[PDB]
């Protein structure tokens, strides 16, 4: 959305109307997030995306900072706080009583999420060592051996 908004801001073109524009915008976005999981900045480069009124070269060249990324995505990061708390509340168990935190889902690789977890859990540190997307599969495999 940000990429489209900035592209449009510069060219006046609705990239959402071109499905191919939108597919590579999603690829770029995915990788942009990935890069910002460690980097403070990432570069989006999609040249000659679509066609404007004057057939001018439309090169999407955008710099997304991790700070900007958070300014944008915190609208969604904040949505997590309430259900985290609702589990805490439903069990009557404070964060200080949690022995271990497990983060799963690749999006938890982001520092925005990590730091949020640190606030959420009072600094109680999530266990790293297994890829968050793979974690569950790993456990399952383990149960498959334990079970049989």
């Amino acid at each position: 959305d940000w990429l489209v908004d900035k592209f449009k801001g510069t060219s006046g073109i609705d990239l959402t109307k071109d499905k191919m524009a939108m597919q590579r915008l999603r690829e770029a976005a995915e990788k942009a997030k990935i890069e910002l999981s460690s980097s403070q900045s990432t570069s989006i480069n999609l040249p000659y995306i679509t066609v404007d009124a004057d057939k001018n070269p439309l090169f999407l060249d955008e710099q997304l900072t991790r700070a900007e990324f958070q300014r944008i995505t915190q609208d969604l990061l904040d949505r997590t706080r309430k259900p985290f708390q609702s589990v805490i509340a439903d069990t009557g168990i404070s964060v200080s009583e949690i022995d271990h935190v497990v983060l799963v889902g690749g999006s938890t690789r982001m520092p925005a999420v990590t730091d949020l977890v640190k606030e959420l859990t009072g600094g109680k540190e999530p266990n790293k060592g297994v890829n968050p997307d793979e974690v569950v599969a790993v456990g399952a495999a383990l149960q498959a051996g334990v079970l049989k």
């Binding site: 191919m20 524009a21 590579r24 999609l46 040249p47 000659y48 679509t50």
Partner: protein, 88 residues
């Protein structure tokens, strides 16, 4: 001209493919770069009389002129000088 038409069309086939492959870099590069580039070149050569390729409204007149000996043509740029120097 013909060559330019062929080239144009090839590029059009490539822009289809860029959309099939989701390649933006080439997608519009073709769609508003290469294709209109050759299109314009084509168009510039395109105006390019003598033996066009179809029986116009004057080939019939020329046949009728061979017939009956009566000349009914268009004053083909050489007789229109004799018909001006006729008096002299």
């Amino acid at each position: 001209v013909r060559d330019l038409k062929e080239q144009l069309e090839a590029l059009r086939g490539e822009s289809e493919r860029a959309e099939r492959d989701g390649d933006l870099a080439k997608a519009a590069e073709l769609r508003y770069g290469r294709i209109p580039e050759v299109e314009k070149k084509l168009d510039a050569a395109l105006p390019q009389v003598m033996l066009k390729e179809e029986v116009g409204p004057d080939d019939i007149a020329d046949v009728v002129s061979a017939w009956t000996g009566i000349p009914a043509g268009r004053l083909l740029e050489g007789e229109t000088a004799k018909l001006l120097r006729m008096e002299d």
